[PDB]
Design a protein around this ligand. Sequence first.
Ligand SMILES: OC[C@H]1O[C@H](O[C@H]2[C@H](O)[C@@H](O)[C@@H](O)O[C@@H]2CO)[C@H](O)[C@@H](O)[C@@H]1O
Ligand SMILES: [Ca+2]
Ligand SMILES: [Ca+2]
Ligand code: NA
Ligand code: NA
Length: 481
Amino acid sequence: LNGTLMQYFEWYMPNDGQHWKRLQNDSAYLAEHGITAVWIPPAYKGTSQDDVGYGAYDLYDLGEFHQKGTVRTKYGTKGELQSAINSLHSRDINVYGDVVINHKGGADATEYVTAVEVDPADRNRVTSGEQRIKAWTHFQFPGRGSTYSDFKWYWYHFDGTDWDESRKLNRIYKFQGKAWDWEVSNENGNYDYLMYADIDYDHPDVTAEIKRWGTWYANELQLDGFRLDAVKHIKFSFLRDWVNHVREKTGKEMFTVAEYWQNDLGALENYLNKTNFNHSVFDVPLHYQFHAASTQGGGYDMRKLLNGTVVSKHPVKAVTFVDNHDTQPGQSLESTVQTWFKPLAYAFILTREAGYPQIFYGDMYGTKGASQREIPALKHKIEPILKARKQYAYGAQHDYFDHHNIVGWTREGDSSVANSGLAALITDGPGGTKRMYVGRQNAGETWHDITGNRSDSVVINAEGWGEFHVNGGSVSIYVQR
Ligand SMILES: OC[C@H]1O[C@H](O[C@H]2[C@H](O)[C@@H](O)[C@@H](O)O[C@@H]2CO)[C@H](O)[C@@H](O)[C@@H]1O
Ligand SMILES: [Ca+2]
Ligand SMILES: [Ca+2]
Ligand code: NA
Ligand code: NA
């Protein structure tokens, strides 16, 4: 009954074209462990076969056409993806497709374009006169032709680019007659520009096309929802309208979560407000608190976890997580939650009542970068916590964030889930004990730590209290034997 998301990729997976098959073969395991939705990496052709998917060369090529030196994407063919999705749907697992619509990379040809340079720290400030550049802006899709869509892209569908091919120079160029879109993040004055060729969401043909592609993509992969990439760089009213449009055309709920990357509740609340709360956001501040706690050796005040997060103020609109493909070691938003703390963070998102929690493929199975800082496979430490969510994390919650290190919470259980109820403790410092209330309805039950970290049983007293233990730097989740 509790919903659990899984991000089903990490940055450094091998480029062997087997990922979709792997996903298909993992669907039984996912369903058995209580995963109810998966966020899949971008499924369309990037700038090369080894593109993780954020290059977004051709949104209508789901590993179906020979373009950029390959038919398959990094992950496999369209048919393989569709077979994975029908296996997941057979076990009632929803599929959320990644939507990369900020930009297009890997244009087929250059165009001569008049542009001005802008200040990378303040993109409202122009720093040159008009100059002629060669920008990678012409998309003809030679391998696809007009199959599924005859829409071709040219420079006038974009606001700018970061590369002049004639001078071989990396600068932010704004094209003649274009304006950065608004509303976007006010970072760097205006953060419309991120990378590759930036889509002009002032252009009416572009807005129409991206909306109609959205519907096509949903049908083609029978998607149940979306993950929106890089939303702080995309006109907010457009994203709002795009989500409404696809819901209207498909007739489905289409759960949507947006990646608005800022460690600031205020900015995320502005985004929610400007999109009329029609979709969720990832709980980026909560991630940064996990990272902080994990790197401060007990010095962090664990009471802080209850404030300044999306889930603390808008729980229905928060997707909580520990790490992702951008925060993992080596990546562009690196802020990895250290290994020792990771299970405590998973207990916080998985066993508490608020928020839609998401598990990271990289945490389950490890990351496969070339460093010696990779996340190790933590599947066996996460599995018990997933089981706690699936079977035990129901009913009224009681919080005990009354200590700098040792904090906890209980769930009373619900009569609709037999034997449900839990008592969780985490500590970023020394271990110890805490008496917590689990409900008089659980009086006399004998509870045990589902993680196996503590071997002691706890008998709930007549008044509904148990004396629970946790080891140093550890997590324990007690549930009924
Ligand atoms: O996991 C499948 C489940 O996901 C969504 O439910 C979310 C809900 O939208 C959020 O507001 C939040 O409270 O968490 C829920 C999952 O625990 C879909 O809305 C729902 O239809 C779907 O079954
Ligand atoms: Ca943009
Ligand atoms: Ca524009
Ligand atoms: Na733009
Ligand atoms: Na602490």
